[PDB]
Amino acid sequence: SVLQVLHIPDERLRKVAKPVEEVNAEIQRIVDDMFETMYAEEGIGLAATQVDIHQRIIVIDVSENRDERLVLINPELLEKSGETGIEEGCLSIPEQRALVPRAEKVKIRALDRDGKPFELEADGLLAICIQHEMDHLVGKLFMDYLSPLKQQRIRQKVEKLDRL
């Protein structure tokens, strides 16, 4: 069911997620509830923190359709390398796009929604995306890598839309 995605001025967005002790049916309900909200909100990746569930659960799908669903439960960063930047956005940060320093390649390990351990070697957009989401699980926002002046402007610009 489409859940409410928290927007910028919200401390809940700055909460560090607590691990999934056991991926059970309830967890799998969540995973699915997320993918719906991501598709509804028309996003490419979403972290549990943005919908208030404070656990290390991340859903992604960088494919054109709804084909390649990617589930990251308890992700662990194994490697990084290189640097790149995309003018990226966030569903919790309405309409504000910005370039941010990111790794070029990244190697992770996590559990799928079945609870099985897997390993990924994302590069390119998928890398940029996994990195962006994982930050969420530690309450870290992309706008955090900006100058205080820009954070102010962003935050400020976003608020007006929220009252509208």
> Catalytic annotation on 21?
no
Query: Could you give the CA distance from residue 18 to residue 22 in angstroms, rounded to a whole number?
Result: 12
Long-range contacts of 120-123 (CB under 8 A, 24+ apart): 120/70
Cβ-proximal residue to Zn ion, closest one: 90
Binding site annotation covers 54? Answer: no
The catalytic residue among 36, 83, 133, 159 is: 133
- The CB-of-141 to Zn ion minimum distance in angstroms stands at 7
Distances (CA, A) of 127 to 64, 80, 85, 112, 122: 17, 9, 11, 18, 5
Residues 6+ apart with CB under 8 A from 7: 13, 92, 93, 94, 158, 162
Binding site annotation covers 90? Answer: yes
Q: Which of residues 87-126 bind Zn ion (CB under 5 A)?
A: 90
CB atoms within 10 A of CB 118: 13
- The CB-of-114 to Zn ion minimum distance in angstroms stands at 26
Q: Which of residues 28-87 bind Zn ion (CB under 5 A)?
A: none
Q: Which is nearer to Zn ion, 95 or 114 (CB)?
A: 95
Q: Which is nearer to Zn ion, 20 or 47 (CB)?
A: 47
Query: Could you give the CA distance from residue 80 to residue 90 in angstroms, rounded to a whole number?
Result: 22
Binding site annotation covers 136? Answer: yes
Q: Which is nearer to Zn ion, 31 or 141 (CB)?
A: 141
Which parts are annotated binding residues?
Answer: 90, 132, 136
- Residues labelled as active-site residues: 133
Residues that bind Zn ion (CB under 5 A): 90
